[PDB]
Design a protein around this ligand. Structure first.
Ligand code: PXY
Ligand code: CL
Length: 162
């Protein structure tokens, strides 16, 4: 078990644009195209991402390419954020996976605004962080995509993905 397998389980796989649980246009393994309400703007972004006219459908290999780029951008987003980095660095290996996963789903901005949970995590207060994450708009809207990640922040084991 590792971040990629953890993410494939949580994001599954679509090979054509859909609306995710927050209502935004997505494809592959949780790849957000745009927050625009315009499907055609989400289409330009996709072609722009692949390097061809798709027009809204991709292959598996191309999905894994996007996936690999997006994991990388999530990690880089954490390391570049002054609020996220010190918290990230104090976490153990498995909770670091739960942190990459959350940034991958929610994006850095939303995550960095959980000042509450951020302090709790750094002080290693797992139960309270867990409780406070299960309160966000992210959890209430995306409970299947989110549940295993909260449980993982709580336990620091992979048991939720087993
Ligand atoms: C790096 C990080 C990711 C997610 C949370 C909720 C906190 C820190
Ligand atoms: Cl969901």
């Amino acid at each position: 078990m590792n971040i990629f397998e953890m993410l494939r389980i949580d994001e599954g796989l679509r090979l054509k644009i859909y609306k995710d649980c927050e209502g935004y246009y997505t494809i592959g393994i949780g790849h957000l195209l745009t927050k625009s309400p315009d499907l055609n703007a989400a289409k330009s972004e996709l072609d722009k991402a692949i390097g061809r006219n798709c027009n809204g459908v991709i292959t598996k290999d191309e999905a894994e390419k996007l996936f690999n780029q997006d994991v990388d951008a999530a990690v880089r987003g954490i390391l570049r954020n002054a609020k996220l980095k010190p918290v990230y660095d104090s976490l153990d290996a498995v909770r670091r996976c739960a942190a990459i996963n959350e940034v991958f789903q929610m994006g850095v901005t939303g995550v960095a605004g959980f000042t509450n949970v951020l302090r709790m995590l750094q002080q290693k207060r797992w139960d309270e962080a867990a409780v406070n994450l299960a309160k966000s708009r992210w959890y209430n809207q995306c409970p299947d995509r989110a549940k295993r990640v909260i449980t993982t922040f709580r336990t620091g084991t992979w048991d939720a993905y087993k």
